[PDB]
């Protein structure tokens, strides 16, 4: 049993997505199926289901209104429609077939994510972070969309004491930061330098730490 | 019908017996078929929630043994009688009597000795300055337990609006925690003050972790 859900969603505010969840290896119309909402970091909010057989849809209140589950049963296929989308509707969406041996959601798809800003796709702009035994320098990638920015240090080369700090959405782009921790014995005779990534608009930007 | 769990977090150690509850407002459990409508599911990062348990204590097919449910009425329990490095995930119940409504999850971290945060400020870089932004940005790195608050000053003088902050979740290799706080503001706004100052609060020190830097 599988169920694989459609690509990654980017959206502004006030259009509407449809979202596919495929399913095979069963019997499409003898379970229903269900849409759970994760929004980046908090927890599952389940949204109503579909019945297969009879297409008659359930919605808890929250989606009532803007939201459609539909089916195309010859293809077991579900779809999500959020109609007028805001905001708060940033979020990856599941859906999950429903066995009745325990009301429980047994398979689930992996997810789609779907993202609503009024932002184009922006490149970020990189800066270093130098200071003033052990120094920390970092790198500041501010203000692109969409996610994801990749970020390595030294070329790939600097391993330990890295870490980077998940991109936070404010004002309808993102910024990230970088951290890496070396000896101070070894910079700025030893040079650092940041390498970013930013896909969705090809670039690519080496940045090196000078004191 | 309202879904309850607690701790939200819960440091274990490998190996060890773990323990976490999971209250409903209303009672689970079918008289007719002596059934409570309650299951447990796991989700860890990046991936889809796998079923555990179901009917409150029937392990889902293929589920390992260390992992049982039991409760019945309003209170339930899951059980993982020996946690390994694989278990470490959120975990939700779910109620299935009336609806089906998830709990709001217990995250399982792993516990260590307690570290107070390495604090780094960093003034903003010429490059941004002649765009005319200015970032200030302070790193809390490498802390434990996961609680800390920081707090900015400008010349003396506590700073609230234009402050961004990013947590890491838990490191995989030394189990730390780390947290950035970006200060942004405009290069004449920077220009006018002499003074920054990045304080962090962190249950391992009576004080707060201050550092700064002139002009
Ligand atoms: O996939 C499903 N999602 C949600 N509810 C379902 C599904 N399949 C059956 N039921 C419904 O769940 C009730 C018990 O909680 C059953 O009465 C049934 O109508």
């Known amino acids: 049993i599988q169920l694989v859900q459609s690509g990654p969603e980017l959206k502004k505010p006030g259009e509407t997505v449809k979202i596919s969840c495929k399913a095979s290896?069963?019997?499409?119309?003898?379970?229903?199926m269900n849409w759970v909402k994760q929004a980046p970091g908090k927890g599952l909010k389940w949204m109503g289901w579909?019945?297969?057989?009879?297409?008659?849809?359930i919605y808890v209140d929250d989606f009532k209104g803007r939201f459609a589950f539909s089916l195309e049963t010859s293809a077991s296929t579900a779809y999500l429609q959020i109609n007028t989308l805001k905001n708060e509707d940033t979020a990856t969406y599941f859906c999950?077939?429903?066995?009745?041996?325990?009301?429980?959601?047994?398979?689930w798809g992996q997810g789609t994510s779907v993202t609503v800003s009024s932002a184009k796709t922006t490149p970020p702009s990189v800066y270093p972070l130098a200071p003033g035994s052990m120094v920390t320098l970092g790198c500041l990638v501010k203000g692109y969309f969409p996610e994801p920015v990749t970020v390595t240090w030294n070329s790939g080369s600097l391993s330990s004491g890295v870490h980077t700090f998940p991109a936070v959405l404010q004002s309808d782009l993102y910024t990230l930061s970088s951290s890496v921790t070396v000896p101070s014995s070894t910079w700025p005779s030893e040079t650092v330098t940041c390498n970013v990534a930013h896909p969705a608009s090809s670039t690519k930007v080496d940045k090196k730490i000078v004191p | 019908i309202v879904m309850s769990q607690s701790p939200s977090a819960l440091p274990v150690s490998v190996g060890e017996k773990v323990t976490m509850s999971c209250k409903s407002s209303?009672?689970?459990?079918?008289?007719?078929?002596?059934?409570?409508?309650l299951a447990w599911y796991q989700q860890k990062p990046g991936q889809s929630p796998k079923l555990l348990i179901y009917?409150?204590?029937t392990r889902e097919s293929g589920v390992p043994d260390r992992f049982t449910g039991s409760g019945s009425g309003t209170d339930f329990t899951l059980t993982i009688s020996s946690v390994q490095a694989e278990d470490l995930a959120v975990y939700y119940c779910?109620?299935?009597?009336?609806?089906?409504?998830f709990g709001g999850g217990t995250k399982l971290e792993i516990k260590r000795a307690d570290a107070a945060p390495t604090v780094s400020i960093f003034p903003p870089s010429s490059e941004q300055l002649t765009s005319g932004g200015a970032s200030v940005v302070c790193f809390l790195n490498n802390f434990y337990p996961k609680d800390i608050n920081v707090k900015w000053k400008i010349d003396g003088s506590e700073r609230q609006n234009g402050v961004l902050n990013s947590w890491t979740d838990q490191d995989s290799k030394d189990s730390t925690y780390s947290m950035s706080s970006t200060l942004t503001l405009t290069k004449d706004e920077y220009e006018r003050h002499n003074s920054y100052t990045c304080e962090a609060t962190h249950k391992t020190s009576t004080s707060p972790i201050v550092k700064s830097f002139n002009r």
């Open positions: 999950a077939r429903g066995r009745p041996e325990g009301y429980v959601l047994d398979y």
């Open positions: 290896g069963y019997t499409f119309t003898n379970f229903g």
């Open positions: 579909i019945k297969t057989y009879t297409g008659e849809p």
């Open positions: 209303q009672s689970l459990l079918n008289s007719r078929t002596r059934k409570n409508y």
């Open positions: 009917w409150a204590s």
């Open positions: 779910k109620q299935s009597y009336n609806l089906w409504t």
